[PDB]
Amino acid sequence: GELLVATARTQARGEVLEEVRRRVREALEALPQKPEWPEVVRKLALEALEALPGAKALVANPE
């Protein structure tokens, strides 16, 4: 019964971290609806062409 308590508790600790992962998922999925979306897209593309010597082409969205 102690092992039953601890397995219910770890199955309960899993769902907290999963709903946190869902919040951050929908957060950076709805992230185009924020005015700093252009700065962050600019920024990470700058980091992509940054950390790769001899970088030639970029691929992105038309948006």
Partner 1 sequence: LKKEYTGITYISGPLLFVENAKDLAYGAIVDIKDGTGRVRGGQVIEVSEEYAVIQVFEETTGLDLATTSVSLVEDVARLGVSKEMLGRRFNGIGKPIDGLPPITPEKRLPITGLPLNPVARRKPEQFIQTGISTIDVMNTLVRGQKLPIFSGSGLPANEIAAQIARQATVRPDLSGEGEKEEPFAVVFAAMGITQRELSYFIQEFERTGALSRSVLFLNKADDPTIERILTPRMALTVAEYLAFEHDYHVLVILTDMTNYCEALREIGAAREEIPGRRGYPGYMYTDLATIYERAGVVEGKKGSVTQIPILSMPDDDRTHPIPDLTGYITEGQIQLSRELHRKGIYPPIDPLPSLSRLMNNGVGKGKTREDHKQVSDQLYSAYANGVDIRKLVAIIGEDALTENDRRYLQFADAFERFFINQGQQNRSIEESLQIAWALLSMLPQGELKRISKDHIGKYYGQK
Rounded to the nearest whole angstrom, what is the least distance from the CB of residue 14 to partner 1 in the complex? 3
| Nearer to partner 1 among residue 11 and residue 33 (C-beta) | 11
Task: Calculate the alpha carbon distances from 14 to 5, 8, 18, 26, 27 in Å.
Answer: 14, 10, 6, 19, 20
Subset of residues 11 to 50 that bind partner 1, contact rule: CB under 8 A: 11, 13-14, 17-18, 47-48
CB–CB of 45/58 below 8 Å?
yes
Q: Give the interface with partner 1 as residue ranges (CB under 8 A).
A: 2-3, 6-7, 10-11, 13-14, 17-18, 47-48, 51-52
